[PDB]
C-alpha cells in the first residue's frame, strides 16, 4: 500500500480565487484600467503574477518601467495577503478533513506540495497543520510544475520515495509533475483539462481513503 499522499493546496485542499480576483480588480480599479471583471478574471486563473499583471496592462495597451511593474505586483500581493486573513476551517474542501484524519490514523504520511508562498499560513488558518508531516518549501525548488521537483521534495521530506506515494492535483501541469516524480496521480476535475490516461474524480468528496486504496490496488 502507498506510504504517503502528496497534496497540492489550491484546488484540492481549498482555494483563494475570490480573494485573488478581488485583489486584481482592486488594483485595476486603482490604476484606472477597465475590464477586470469575473469573466476576464478566468484568464488569470493559474497564471503567474507577472503574466497576470501584463494581461491587465494589455487591456489599456499600458506601458510601464521595471520598477512600476514590481510595485504594482507588490500592491496586488499586499491586497491578497490582507484578504486571506479571513481564511477559516470552513474553507476546507469537502472530504479533505476526513481524508487527512483517515490517512493519519492509518499512519500514511501527509505532505504539502504547493507552490503557494502562503502554504503554512493557510494550513494554520484552516486548522490543518497537525495533519501535515511536512510542507515542501517552494522557495527551495529549482523549478515549478510541470517540473516534478516539488513532489519529489514533498515525498523525500516525509522519508519516502515518490514511487511510494499518491499525488492529488486539479491542474494539468500538476498531474504531469506527479507523473514525472514517479508518484501515482489522482486528479479532481475533468478529462478535458487533466488528461484521460489518469484516474480523475469529479470533486474532492470522492477523495476517500477507501478509494485511494482501490486505485493503488489497480
- Per-residue contact string for residues 156-195; x = within reach of Mg ion by CB under 5 A: --------------xx------------------------
Look at the block and give the residue holding cell 477507501. Answer: 210
Q: Does 10 bind Mg ion (CB under 5 A)?
A: yes
Grid cell in block for residue 189:
476535475
Alpha-carbon distance 5 to 103, whole Å? 8
Rg, the chain, Cα only = 18
Binding of residue 154 to Mg ion (CB under 5 A): no
Q: Is 196 annotated as a binding residue?
A: no
Q: For residues 152 and 42, what is the distance between their CA atoms, to the nearest angstrom? A: 30
User: Near Mg ion by CB under 5 A, which window of 9-17, 28-36, 67-75, 90-98?
Assistant: 9-17
207 belongs to the binding site for Mg ion (CB under 5 A): no
- Reply yes or no on whether 10 is catalytic: yes
Stretch that binds Mg ion, among 6-14, 28-36, 62-70, 91-99 (CB under 5 A): 6-14
Is 193 part of the annotated catalytic residue set? no
Which 11-30 positions form the footprint of Mg ion (CB under 5 A)?
Answer: 11
Tell me if 57 sits within 8 A of 33, measured CB to CB. Answer: yes
Please state the length of the chain. 218
Give the separation between CA 172 and CA 135, rounded to whole angstroms: 21
Among positions 2, 4, 6, 8, the unique one binding Mg ion when judged by CB under 5 A = 8
Which residue, 162 or 187, has its beta carbon nearer to Mg ion?
187
Cα dihedral sign, 59-62-67-68: negative
CA dihedral 53, 117, 89, 202 (to 10 degrees): 70
Q: Which of 8, 61, 133, 137 is catalytic?
A: 8
Give the interface size with Mg ion as a residue count (CB under 5 A): 5
Q: Which spans of this chain sit near Mg ion (rule: CB under 5 A)?
A: 8, 10-11, 170-171
The residues assigned a catalytic role are 8, 10
Amino acid at each position: 500500500m502507498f506510504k504517503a499522499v502528496l497534496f497540492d493546496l489550491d484546488g484540492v485542499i481549498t482555494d483563494t480565487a475570490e480573494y485573488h480576483f478581488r485583489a486584481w480588480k482592486a488594483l485595476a480599479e486603482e490604476i484606472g484600467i477597465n475590464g477586470v471583471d469575473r469573466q476576464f478574471n478566468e484568464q488569470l486563473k493559474g497564471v503567474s503574477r507577472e503574466d497576470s499583471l501584463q494581461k491587465i496592462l494589455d487591456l489599456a495597451d499600458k506601458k510601464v518601467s521595471a520598477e512600476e511593474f514590481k510595485e504594482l505586483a507588490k500592491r496586488k500581493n499586499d491586497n491578497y495577503v490582507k484578504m486571506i486573513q479571513d481564511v477559516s476551517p470552513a474553507d476546507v474542501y469537502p472530504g479533505i478533513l476526513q481524508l487527512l484524519k483517515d490517512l493519519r490514523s492509518n499512519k500514511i504520511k501527509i505532505a504539502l506540495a504547493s507552490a503557494s508562498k502562503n502554504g503554512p499560513f493557510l494550513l494554520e488558518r484552516m486548522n490543518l497543520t497537525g495533519y501535515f508531516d511536512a510542507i515542501a518549501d517552494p522557495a527551495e525548488v529549482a523549478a515549478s510544475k510541470p517540473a516534478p521537483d516539488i513532489f519529489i521534495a514533498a515525498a523525500h521530506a516525509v522519508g519516502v520515495a515518490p514511487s511510494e506515494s499518491i499525488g492529488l492535483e486539479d491542474s494539468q501541469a500538476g498531474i504531469q509533475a506527479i507523473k514525472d516524480s514517479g508518484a501515482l496521480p489522482i486528479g479532481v476535475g475533468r478529462p478535458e483539462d487533466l488528461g484521460d490516461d489518469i484516474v480523475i474524480v469529479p470533486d474532492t468528496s470522492h477523495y476517500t481513503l477507501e478509494f485511494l486504496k482501490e486505485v493503488w490496488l489497480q
